Design a protein. Sequence first.
Length: 53
Amino acid sequence: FQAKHMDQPLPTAIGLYKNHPLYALKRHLLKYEAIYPETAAILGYCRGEAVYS
DNA sequence: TGGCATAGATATCGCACGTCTATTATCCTCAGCGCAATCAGCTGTGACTACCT
């Protein structure tokens, strides 16, 4: 099931990345949330925005 | 027959509305210091009495 889920390239809507464990966009990060490491792998690009786990 | 203007279906991000929890100061009340008019003991005054000449 995890392998099948990873087969999805990226959702079509930026809003789908909000508070999503597999999506986790940049703008949606809360006050206490930060990307570590800052050199993490990019899962994809949605409308110019990089996707991180 | 072939390329592109234009009408249809579908979301989509930005903007505003309803709601909550934070991680270290403020406010009544009592025992101990004061200020203002009587009253008793210290001090001053008058009289009793032993002592010296």
